[PDB]
């Protein structure tokens, strides 16, 4: 028996879903928005450090809107559940992100300056990020 006469490769229909859509960041505020296509932990510096590079990038000035904030503890210890002599030294705080999360968003600046600036922030990020307009998402051929 290699190929029965009843079984069939079944799969889901389409990838997107209009029903369950709780937490789908697109842009929010501004004209553009930097989305994180991968899960990662954004440090405090990544938020300000990246913003500084972006603000300076805009040759014709510009303003950025940040929503991500460090809250989730950042420890380099694999196991530490109910174990320890008190509490280990935390290596700062980070902001957990997921694929499709707008961590940044600019407005007023040109597409070239905005797209590049938004990229500069993701350049130093530990995940992939792309530029998108206020709810501007096209298909990828």
From Swiss-Prot:
> Which BP terms in the Gene Ontology apply to this protein?
translation
Its name, as the record gives it, is Large ribosomal subunit protein uL16
A single GO molecular-function term is: rRNA binding
Keyword Transmembrane helix annotated: no
CDD domains assigned to the protein according to its UniProt record, in alphabetical order: Ribosomal_L16_L10e (cd01433)
Q: What does this protein do?
A: This protein binds directly to 23S rRNA. Interacts with the A site tRNA.
Return any one Pfam family short name.
Ribosomal_L16
Query: What subunit structure does UniProt give?
Result: Part of the 50S ribosomal subunit.
Q: Which UniProt keywords apply?
A: Ribonucleoprotein, Ribosomal protein, RNA-binding, rRNA-binding, tRNA-binding
Q: Name one GO cellular component term.
A: cytosolic large ribosomal subunit
Tell me the Gene3D superfamilies matching this sequence: Ribosomal protein L10e/L16
Indicate the family of this protein.
Belongs to the universal ribosomal protein uL16 family.
Q: Which InterPro entries match?
A: Ribosomal_uL16, Ribosomal_uL16_bact-type, Ribosomal_uL16_dom, Ribosomal_uL16_sf
